[PDB]
Amino acid sequence: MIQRTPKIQVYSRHPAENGKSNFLNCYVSGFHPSDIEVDLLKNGERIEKVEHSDLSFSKDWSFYLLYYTEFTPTEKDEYACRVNHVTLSQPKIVKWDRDM
Amino acid sequence: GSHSMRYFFTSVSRPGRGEPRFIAVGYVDDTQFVRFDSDAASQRMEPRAPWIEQEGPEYWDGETRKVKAHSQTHRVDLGTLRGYYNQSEAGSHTVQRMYGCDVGSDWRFLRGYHQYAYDGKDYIALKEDLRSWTAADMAAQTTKHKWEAAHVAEQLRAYLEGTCVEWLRRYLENGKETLQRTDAPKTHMTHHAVSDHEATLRCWALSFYPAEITLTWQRDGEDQTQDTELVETRPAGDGTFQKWAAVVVPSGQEQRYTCHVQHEGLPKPLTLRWEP
Amino acid sequence: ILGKFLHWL
């Protein structure tokens, strides 16, 4: 039995422009085992309608998943991704950066 | 040139509450086309690409019969492995399986695969000859002996060399327009001052397919990997992919660095520079 | 298309 902590990326589907509809993504990968909790946040609050790809895995057997939701970036709104996994003793929050 | 078809299966035990989670997923190349989830209401193999929707009811019935069978074998495999490794019922475990074939540009058979993993560690694998097995330890060797007597390798060879290929071609001809497309990455560069003495240059590749790609940095035309950062290639949610590569550099020396990008859609690779 | 596989570890 081995455990690999997830890598996390937060990003938009298309380059961001304030006031243009887009998609916010949280890609979690390289993790094991498969159970994982991922939320997208807006100003610290959980967004309820988020979709996700079907569970799949890489050559090393580690899993990956894509969570996503429609959004419209703005000057001051703050979006993030919060993740929990056996490997983490507390949820990890990754803020979205327009340029990573 | 080459193409692949790949099926992936994951079962997870749930000591508390009933049967294991089973999730199965099929790809050609980097495009998911099918899925099953033991927890979904439909209890059916579901399409996940437009071009597979054409296939008729017999197809979905056949595929559904078979994914269910696969999940049953996994259900029992979990029990079997708890026995082999002498583990308690407490605690959740994971069995994974993948199999598939590759073909070359001519679309002739190139290579086959079939492997299992237990709790994220290689358990047993069909060897490239498709005749023989690699078995990790005593437990896997038991399985190997069972499979040798049950002629499983023959069963797999017949699928991997024949059916797997014949259907891969069929798929590549339906939804030709999605699977045989190549979308060259759209590229650009950004600059950020890290400190008074240095800067990062980040090289972007966007909107590309398929996922294979290479981003490389040079200084005065010499390959550099010192002080570089790559990110794992990642899905935009729309069938395409993204990646960036960054390097930190002394400030004032940006002109000496170039980023080189290679992809199926760029027979002659691109190079990029910071335009001040 | 899936393999017609009834295989047990």
Author numbering:
A (entry chain B): 0 to 99
B (entry chain A): 1 to 276
C (entry chain C): 1 to 9
Question: Can I see the authors' text?
Answer:
Recognition of peptide-major histocompatibility complexes (pMHCs)5 by the clonally expressed αβ T-cell receptor (TCR) mediates T-cell immunity. Here, we used a well characterized CD8+ T-cell clone (ILA1) that responds to residues 540–548 (sequence, ILAKFLHWL) of human telomerase reverse transcriptase to further investigate the structural basis of TCR degeneracy. Here, we solved the structure of the ILA1 TCR in complex with HLA-A*0201-ILAKFLHWL (A2-ILA) and several previously defined APLs. Combined with biophysical analysis, we demonstrate the molecular mechanism for antigen discrimination by the ILA1 TCR and model the mode of cross-reactivity with these APLs.
